Amino acid sequence: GHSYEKYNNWETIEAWTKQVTSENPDLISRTAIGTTFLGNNIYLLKVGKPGPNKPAIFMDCGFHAREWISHAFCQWFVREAVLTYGYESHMTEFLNKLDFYVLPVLNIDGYIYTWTKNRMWRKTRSTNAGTTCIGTDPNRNFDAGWCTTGASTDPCDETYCGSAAESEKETKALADFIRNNLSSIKAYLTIHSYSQMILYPYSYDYKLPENNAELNNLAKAAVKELATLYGTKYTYGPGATTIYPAAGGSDDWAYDQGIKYSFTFELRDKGRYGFILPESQIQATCEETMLAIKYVTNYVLGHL
Numbered sequence: 279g280h281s282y283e284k285y286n287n288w289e290t291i292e293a294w295t296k297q298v299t300s301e302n303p304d305l306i307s308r309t310a311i312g313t314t315f316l317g318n319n320i321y322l323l324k325v326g327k328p329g330p331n332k333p334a335i336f337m338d339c340g341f342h343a344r345e346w347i348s349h350a351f352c353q354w355f356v357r358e359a360v361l362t363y364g365y366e367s368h369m370t371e372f373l374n375k376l377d378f379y380v381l382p383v384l385n386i387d388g389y390i391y392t393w394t395k396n397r398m399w400r401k402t403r404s405t406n407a408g409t410t411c412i413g414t415d416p417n418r419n420f421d422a423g424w425c426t427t428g429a430s431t432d433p434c435d436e437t438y439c440g441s442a443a444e445s446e447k448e449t450k451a452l453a454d455f456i457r458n459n460l461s462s463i464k465a466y467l468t469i470h471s472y473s474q475m476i477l478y479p480y481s482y483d484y485k486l487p488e489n490n491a492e493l494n495n496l497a498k499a500a501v502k503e504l505a506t507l508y509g510t511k512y513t514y515g516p517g518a519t520t521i522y523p524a525a526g527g528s529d530d531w532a533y534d535q536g537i538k539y540s541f542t543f544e545l546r547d548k549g550r551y552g553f554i555l556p557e558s559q560i561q562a563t564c565e566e567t568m569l570a571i572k573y574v575t576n577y578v579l580g581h582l
């Protein structure tokens with residue numbers, strides 16, 4: 279059923295999280311960090327060889343239900359880790375010295391919906407008071423300038439901020455996990471599509487983070503690294519001026535907790551296919567994105 283070169287439905291990805299953990303017990307363990315609105319387990323894979331006092335990098339995919347290449351990329355990252363550990367000096371060093379928390383799908387209820395009913399759904403599938411319109415934008419539901427700019431207060435809108443910050447079970451589960459592990463998590467990476475960008479804070483206001491120069495230089499070099507493979511062109515910069523203002527994002531929230539390396543990736547393409555990126559582009563998109571993620575990982579490891 280599962281293939282890393284096709285899009286996999288939730289049943290298949292869930293079964294994969296179990297099987298990949300079973301097949302690689304020395305590098306992977308699996309937990310659930312909460313349940314979704316509909317009661318599905320939100321699985322998280324911890325990827326790394328055990329060791330003392332290891333720092334960690336946290337990566338999630340699948341915030342937005344229709345962005346199928348995001349879900350495929352978290353799977354590809356785990357595929358690379360298990361395949362190349364032992365053979366490739368950098369990935370082996372990475373897994374020996376840090377752990378990666380990989381959350382392959384945050385918004386599982388929306389993801390199921392995109393397979394059963396509406397390919398173009400974005401939000402969660404929770405209800406809203408006073409209306410029949412469904413869902414909240416999880417990337418406007420974090421407590422970071424919550425509901426102030428670039429988010430809608432209308433529950434029927436695609437960027438609805440929700441009833442309160444962390445009103446969604448899924449964003450509360452993610453925020454609780456990160457707060458519970460803040461002393462080990464040194465970087466936060468959140469994978470989306472489309473439009474080919476590497477963003478860092480801030481998006482909730484036009485303001486820049488304390489380590490702006492460092493983030494700017496790191497994002498510039500990771501885009502240069504991404505382009506080596508296929509010439510794919512990314513832009514980069516602080517979210518508010520690089521893409522648009524958007525309050526309530528998990529990247530900004532994570533940075534405000536003290537996680538100094540916080541990045542949002544918008545993968546391929548630039549709009550020819552948009553969210554319906556064909557399966558035939560999974561491999562090239564994931565391979566080039568692996569080069570930027572490994573670049574960032576190496577940097578974090580080298581600047582502890």
Ligand SMILES: NCCCCC[C@@H](C[SeH])C(=O)O
Nearest residue numbers: 417470481517524527529542
């Ligand atoms: N904190 C958001 C970073 C910039 C906007 C990201 C895009 C990904 Se689809 C969005 O959530 O609208």
Ligand SMILES: C[As](C)(=O)[O-]
Nearest residue numbers: 471472473521544
């Ligand atoms: C092109 As977009 C910010 O709606 O993924």
Ligand SMILES: [Zn+2]
Nearest residue numbers: 342345470471
């Ligand atoms: Zn998105």
Ligand SMILES: [Zn+2]
Nearest residue numbers: 470471472544
């Ligand atoms: Zn996007």
Ligand SMILES: [Zn+2]
Nearest residue numbers: 358564565568
């Ligand atoms: Zn590869």
